[PDB]
Amino acid sequence: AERSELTIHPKEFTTFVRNFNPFLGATNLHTTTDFIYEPLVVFNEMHGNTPVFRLAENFQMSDDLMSVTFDIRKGVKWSDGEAFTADDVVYSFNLVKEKPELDQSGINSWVTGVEKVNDYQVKFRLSEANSNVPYEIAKVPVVPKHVWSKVKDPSTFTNENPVGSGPFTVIDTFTPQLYIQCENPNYWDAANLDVDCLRVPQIANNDQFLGKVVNGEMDWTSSFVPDIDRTYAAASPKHHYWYPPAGTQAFVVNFKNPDAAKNEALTNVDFRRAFSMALDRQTIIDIAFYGGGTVNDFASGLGYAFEAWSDEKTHDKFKAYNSYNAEGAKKLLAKAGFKDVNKDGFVDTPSGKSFELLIQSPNGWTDFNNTVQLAVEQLAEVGIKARARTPDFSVYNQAMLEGTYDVAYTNYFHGADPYTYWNSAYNSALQSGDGMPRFAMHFYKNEKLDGLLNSFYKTADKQEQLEIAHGIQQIIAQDQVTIPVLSGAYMYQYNTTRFTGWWNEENPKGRPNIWAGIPERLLHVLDLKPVK
Ligand SMILES: CC(=O)N[C@@H]1[C@@H](O)[C@H](O[C@@H]2O[C@H](CO)[C@@H](O)[C@H](O)[C@H]2NC(C)=O)[C@@H](CO)O[C@H]1O
Ligand code: NI
């Protein structure tokens, strides 16, 4: 026919609401970052953070590592025809500093100010030395000053008719069950783009998705698929996948729970170690993930992808509390004083109050929902009372930000080194702020761990970063802050019916996933060519 439509699935929803504000990650559509608002630079995390220069053509840190200058590409246009300039970068950083609810990554902890040098150069000043700061700066969306500076309230603006810098800005069709986002008519990198539109169908959960993917309806996806070789891969020789190793998954407990009895259990080190010993991590991997994961027996969560970074003395000291041992969990509850005093057959708190733990995972994430149900059975076998909850993602996330939940099962982002995990999962600076994600929302606050995390990139010296890692690894392991379970996979399925050029095990160019927060998806769509 006359245009290519590439069918993708970045996020499950029951109905689409029209919201393309790139600062509102808890309520927007997940083709806004990258595809509407292109970054300054994309770093290829699977390949050493090798840079790909996009809206900026270069950057340079100062000698003292307290500032950085970015060079803006000349001849780039916004989708309405206006020039992209340093003014747009200065405006967007000043907006996130002034309305801190729009900071989704912690940038206001690192950047104190932003100066225009001229129309094509911007200078950033820092609170503290950070050789990794260009990677942090590239997370922040840059929007057009000429539109956003006239909006009454950017933190409530739904941006229904977006003006963007990236490959797909035109809202061709919008309905609550399907939308189609087509090529920016002034795209600066039009010569490299061979896809006309993204086609985004509404899919609520993994059972609805399995029906569509088995029937060949999808092109680019990253959902959990049960029994994948016998269901999806067996339906057609056009159906393919590639699952490179991803990050940690853990049970996270709330140290500020407002119920006195639950707070007494969750904040007790012995209780978190007994919870951890009750679990059988390899059975969770075999049943809930059909084998698609690796045990994580690091109290610190570090994981076997980063075994070369481990202090093995620390790993070996706490490994027994992160291995299956049901008898040991019963003995530890008894020594610590979690005794059944009300005769209901479950342990009560040291003060003698009865409690039950409510363990949440998101609606429709069936691999995580099954993991929690297996853990609730394992926990009952040592006398710990728990039950599963499966809230909608927006309610799951809000309950973490507000400190209203008991325990949550979650994964984390995965980087080129351990900092992406440790900093997002533990820095107390990421516990306050209405735009922050859920990952640090346990409310365990330790200023000495924060000092070590903040020191990791004060130089670029990797031998010193390995010693700083050993300190971080020891503090988290000795306090058993969360209960790590396994290291997961970057789930990804591609179809060769309508497009070619896909990344895969023989073409392993970068993280291949379609989710928001994987900025390499802009690089991967620039490699795709229609066959129909
Ligand atoms: C670190 C992180 O938050 N990753 C999120 C992805 O896990 C999530 O994808 C969903 O993962 C569930 C757990 O493995 C799968 O059951 C589910 O099929 C999958 N959903 C899709 C649409 O791929 C994505 C999307 O919710 O958000 C990432 O941020
Ligand atoms: Ni450890």
Side-chain angles (χ1 to χ4, degrees):
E2 53 201 317
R3 69 186 194 187
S4 52
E5 295 180 5
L6 172 75
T7 293
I8 61 168
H9 177 37
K11 176 63 171 353
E12 60 279 272
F13 286 115
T14 44
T15 65
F16 294 133
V17 174
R18 193 174 175 150
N19 176 347
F20 294 111
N21 185 329
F23 303 105
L24 296 180
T27 59
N28 68 11
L29 293 166
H30 280 218
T31 56
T32 306
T33 57
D34 313 315
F35 296 132
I36 307 186
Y37 299 101
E38 181 158 328
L40 299 177
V41 182
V42 175
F43 296 94
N44 192 321
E45 308 195 26
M46 183 177 280
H47 289 292
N49 288 340
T50 294
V52 188
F53 294 97
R54 306 301 301 174
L55 309 186
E57 68 191 5
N58 217 326
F59 59 80
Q60 180 63 257
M61 300 275 335
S62 68
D63 284 319
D64 62 3
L65 307 182
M66 301 294 292
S67 64
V68 55
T69 289
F70 274 73
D71 297 348
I72 311 309
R73 283 192 188 269
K74 300 174 186 73
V76 177
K77 297 173 184 99
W78 295 106
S79 60
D80 58 5
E82 287 228 10
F84 181 91
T85 73
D87 293 344
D88 299 303
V89 182
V90 173
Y91 166 78
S92 293
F93 279 76
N94 284 320
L95 176 56
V96 170
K97 198 177 174 186
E98 280 177 53
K99 296 282 234 151
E101 62 274 25
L102 298 182
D103 184 7
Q104 292 171 106
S105 59
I107 196 67
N108 288 330
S109 298
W110 290 110
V111 175
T112 60
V114 184
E115 299 172 28
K116 180 187 192 174
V117 180
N118 57 57
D119 276 12
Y120 306 94
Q121 288 188 284
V122 177
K123 192 170 166 259
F124 300 80
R125 310 265 327 131
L126 311 187
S127 63
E128 169 66 295
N130 183 351
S131 64
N132 185 52
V133 85
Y135 178 88
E136 302 296 334
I137 277 166
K139 298 179 176 172
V140 179
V142 176
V143 294
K145 178 179 194 250
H146 74 274
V147 177
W148 287 66
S149 77
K150 297 302 189 285
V151 161
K152 44 241 171 151
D153 183 7
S155 84
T156 59
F157 176 49
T158 52
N159 196 30
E160 295 189 330
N161 298 291
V163 166
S165 58
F168 308 104
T169 63
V170 174
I171 313 308
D172 168 86
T173 296
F174 193 88
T175 68
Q177 319 73 30
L178 175 74
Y179 68 96
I180 301 176
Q181 190 178 313
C182 294
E183 199 183 336
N184 171 355
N186 286 295
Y187 189 45
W188 77 283
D189 197 26
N192 280 302
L193 187 61
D194 306 300
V195 174
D196 300 294
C197 306
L198 296 180
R199 175 183 177 271
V200 191
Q202 174 273 306
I203 299 166
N205 62 30
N206 286 350
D207 290 333
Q208 185 182 359
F209 178 75
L210 186 61
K212 307 182 59 92
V213 86
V214 170
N215 279 309
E217 306 190 329
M218 307 306 289
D219 298 311
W220 187 5
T221 58
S222 296
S223 288
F224 176 67
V225 172
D227 213 342
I228 193 168
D229 291 325
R230 306 191 312 183
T231 57
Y232 165 67
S236 170
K238 314 299 273 194
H239 287 178
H240 303 279
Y241 62 81
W242 175 42
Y243 282 37
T248 293
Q249 295 182 18
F251 293 96
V252 176
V253 309
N254 187 0
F255 280 73
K256 291 301 182 192
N257 190 283
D259 178 68
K262 297 174 190 236
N263 195 89
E264 200 172 355
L266 298 169
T267 61
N268 187 289
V269 171
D270 293 317
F271 186 75
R272 295 192 303 275
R273 293 175 172 156
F275 181 120
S276 180
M277 290 186 285
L279 304 181
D280 177 0
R281 286 160 172 78
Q282 190 65 55
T283 293
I284 287 170
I285 288 159
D286 292 354
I287 299 178
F289 297 90
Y290 286 79
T294 293
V295 166
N296 189 336
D297 60 6
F298 292 81
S300 67
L302 179 64
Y304 286 104
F306 294 122
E307 194 182 19
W309 290 80
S310 177
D311 181 338
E312 292 281 284
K313 292 192 208 288
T314 294
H315 183 200
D316 284 358
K317 187 181 178 197
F318 304 98
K319 192 189 278 180
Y321 298 126
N322 297 259
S323 294
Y324 183 36
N325 190 350
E327 292 315 295
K330 288 186 198 156
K331 288 170 162 127
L332 176 52
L333 292 165
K335 285 186 304 184
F338 287 83
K339 177 183 173 181
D340 183 10
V341 293
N342 71 356
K343 299 184 190 74
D344 73 7
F346 293 96
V347 305
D348 303 319
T349 67
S351 74
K353 308 167 165 176
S354 191
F355 69 97
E356 58 169 14
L357 300 185
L358 310 169
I359 306 181
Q360 56 167 26
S361 63
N363 197 277
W365 301 23
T366 53
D367 48 344
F368 281 31
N369 302 154
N370 289 337
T371 293
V372 173
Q373 187 51 41
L374 285 169
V376 160
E377 292 165 14
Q378 295 165 357
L379 292 161
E381 291 292 306
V382 306
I384 296 172
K385 203 171 193 208
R387 64 161 177 289
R389 289 185 161 185
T390 56
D392 180 66
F393 182 88
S394 65
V395 168
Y396 167 88
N397 186 67
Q398 189 61 24
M400 294 182 78
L401 271 59
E402 282 176 359
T404 57
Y405 76 108
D406 294 2
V407 184
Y409 192 76
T410 187
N411 51 354
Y412 300 86
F413 280 99
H414 181 64
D417 65 27
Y419 179 93
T420 293
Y421 169 67
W422 277 327
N423 200 56
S424 70
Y426 300 94
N427 199 306
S428 82
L430 298 173
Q431 295 181 342
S432 176
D434 285 356
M436 285 294 102
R438 71 195 177 268
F439 303 108
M441 300 292 176
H442 46 59
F443 307 104
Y444 165 96
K445 180 163 195 320
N446 182 326
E447 304 213 292
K448 306 302 289 208
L449 178 60
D450 289 349
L452 288 171
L453 292 166
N454 300 336
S455 77
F456 193 86
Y457 294 118
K458 284 176 83 156
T459 78
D461 183 294
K462 294 227 180 303
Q463 256 170 42
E464 193 51 42
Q465 282 173 14
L466 182 59
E467 291 300 310
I468 292 170
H470 299 344
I472 288 165
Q473 186 182 0
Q474 189 174 336
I475 291 170
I476 296 173
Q478 72 193 8
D479 284 345
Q480 191 72 57
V481 176
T482 71
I483 299 106
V485 176
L486 58 81
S487 295
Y490 276 123
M491 292 157 303
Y492 154 72
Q493 310 85 23
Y494 59 104
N495 194 319
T496 49
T497 298
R498 304 155 283 275
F499 297 85
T500 188
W502 299 102
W503 303 350
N504 67 35
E505 75 275 10
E506 294 185 351
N507 186 35
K509 291 187 57 167
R511 295 181 305 170
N513 308 86
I514 186 51
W515 305 314
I518 301 292
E520 296 94 321
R521 71 189 179 155
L522 172 61
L523 311 178
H524 194 176
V525 79
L526 295 164
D527 267 4
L528 297 182
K529 284 189 188 290
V531 199
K532 273 118 95 129

